[PDB]
Ligand SMILES: C[N+](C)(C)CCOP(=O)([O-])OP(=O)(O)OC[C@H]1O[C@@H](n2ccc(N)nc2=O)[C@H](O)[C@@H]1O
Ligand SMILES: C[N+](C)(C)CCOP(=O)([O-])OP(=O)(O)OC[C@H]1O[C@@H](n2ccc(N)nc2=O)[C@H](O)[C@@H]1O
Ligand SMILES: [Mg+2]
């Protein structure tokens with residue numbers, strides 16, 4: 069998976085990040101207090117795995133009770149989703165703090181953190197689409213899922229072209245707090261709160277979240293793109309690895325363009341009746357494409373625009389070219405299974421190789 | 433176009449070939465006699481350019497008088513085609529002999545010879561399809577053109593995996609003699625000779641050429657493929673450049689598969705009403721893909737499966753994916769023009785670079 073030179077350059081890696089948000093200091097104190105009361109023999113990898121597992125399980129339950137994102141869900145699922153998201157955020161902060169101390173820091177923890185963040189953000193966006201019932205507005209339904217995907221991959225892309233993580237003021241913490249309070253409010257008042265139209269303008273309640281999302285996206289995107297263009301750490305404004313600045317842009321453009329092209333020529337409404345499966349398949353694809361860039365900027369190597377993850381989208385595209393011999397509902401499942409298996413294989417292989425080199429006993 | 437290392441390895445190149453055919457010795461004596469009476473100040477590049485120009489012009493006239501390959505042509509075009517083919521063969525033999533003497537040998541002459549052979553074989557196959565009127569049998573119409581293309585590219589592919597040219601007994605000389613005598617007979621007796629059905633079996637006259645073609649193809653293919661597998665000159669059975677043995681096979685498989693895929697999903701009979709344009713466009717594409725391998729095995733470098741020549745086939749494929757917004761008769765012309773321009777640009781650039789390095793005054 070990783071060449072000898074890349075694996076050699078993996079060592080002597082210094083984690084560095086600068087930034088702070090509005091709600092950080094109080095929650096920073098809270099996380100410090102909670103981590104003050106954690107056993108010293110527990111490994112951070114177990115903590116992040118548990119957090120990811122809880123978040124994914126709760127989101128999976130909510131998605132299974134609400135296919136197409138237009139039905140309603142009981143108190144059970146919403147409470148479970150809110151608890152899972154809060155636990156995920158808490159465990160992320162706590163295992164970060166516990167890994168910085170007790171001299172357990174390693175390059176593998178960063179890879180686990182970023183992969184878990186990718187999967188968790190995909191599932192959280194799916195859950196927040198399912199809870200609001202954003203199926204009565206079919207126009208604003210591709211945008212939310214794939215802008216969450218695009219925003220996270222652009223955060224990674226900003227990281228690749230620079231050397232330090234830069235934190236904004238509308239970063240992940242506020243988004244997670246807003247989603248948690250939204251889930252709690254929807255649970256306590258019922259799923260029909262978003263059908264309680266605002267006294268004026270004839271616009272429903274759901275415009276209050278969506279607009280904010282768009283605004284946040286704009287702000288976030290702005291910052292990232294500036295660091296892409298004005299900033300450069302290599303011999304010039306070029307990439308830290310010496311390559312071009314806009315290479316992974318081709319990766320994400322290809323992924324999103326293929327998604328849009330398959331969306332627009334379904335002839336059987338592939339997306340509006342199977343949204344969760346579609347978003348999950350392309351989320352696994354983009355998760356692999358984002359984990360590749362993580363290893364790319366941890367090391368100093370160069371990425372290619374050819375991966376064994378376009379098998380799913382490739383099958384969909386080549387089953388759309390030929391008019392219709394296989395119906396477009398089994399091919400989606402095959403693509404999702406293939407993408408999930410490929411992602412799991414890649415992650416396991418990389419983890420095993422890094423463990424073998426660094427002799428760190430990944431779970432210990 | 434060519435890197436410094438490749439251009440350095442271009443020198444110290446020794447042309448070597450072994451083989452002989454049945455009709456060679458008499459025609460060998462004839463060519464020796466004719467070259468005995470040629471001026472000593474004339475360059476071989478001019479001779480091969482003149483031969484290629486005459487062959488292409490005569491074939492173009494014949495093709496223009498017979499689109500779709502089902503009409504008839506007068507005495508004029510058939511006589512001109514026979515004379516042009518005979519002159520092309522004579523000039524090839526003569527300029528080869530004249531380049532071996534007068535110490536004018538250079539690596540550029542080989543590239544000119546192979547490019548001219550590619551273009552000439554494409555045009556000769558088009559002419560022999562047009563003359564026989566092989567349009568009343570639409571099944572056996574893709575096969576002939578693309579098997580000529582495939583056979584020449586496989587001869588080059590056999591050359592790449594070895595070090596010396598191997599000549600068979602049913603090689604190009606007999607094919608050209610057969611085509612010349614066929615053109616002469618069709619001229620003298622009229623185009624309707626192939627509608628003079630053989631006293632038995634109810635099969636028309638055209639089965640006499642076609643069957644032979646198939647047989648010849650089989651024999652030729654056999655030899656080439658054996659040299660591909662049993663023979664190896666590198667550290668192992670591997671390529672002389674050290675790469676895999678079956679890499680250009682992907683190139684030709686991609687070209688022919690794309691041609692077949694565009695053929696089979698036309699929905700407007702793109703091929704059976706515009707055969708000459710179709711074959712010419714894909715002939716230019718394969719001519720560029722075959723000239724690349726010529727430089728590849730003259731040097732010791734490695735080829736890629738990514739060229740700026742799939743623009744035409746790419747436009748056709750992506751205009752077939754979207755149902756139909758641009759009609760499928762202008763896109764073919766655009767693809768043909770783009771392919772021809774790209775081939776001309778590549779050839780001119782390579783010729784100019786080699787002339788600049790070797791200071792040989794290409795035409796002198
Ligand atoms: C901004 N916050 C603090 C609210 C949350 C995001 O912060 P973060 O997760 O990027 O930072 P962190 O505190 O987790 O990072 C501590 C470092 O510990 C390492 N790490 C992470 C996870 C893990 N299981 N083992 C580790 O050793 C990583 O290199 C990580 O960079
Ligand atoms: C088998 N024959 C003899 C019937 C025809 C095919 O033979 P061929 O064209 O491969 O051989 P040839 O006699 O042309 O080759 C002589 C050599 O002269 C060189 N050559 C060719 C053409 C040219 N304009 N200038 C040259 O210097 C090439 O390296 C070529 O290999
Ligand atoms: Mg963390």
Ligand SMILES: [Mg+2]
Nearest residue numbers: 160181184185
């Ligand atoms: Mg995390």
Ligand SMILES: [Mg+2]
Nearest residue numbers: 524525528545
């Ligand atoms: Mg010659």
Ligand SMILES: [Mg+2]
Nearest residue numbers: 524545548549
């Ligand atoms: Mg020749």
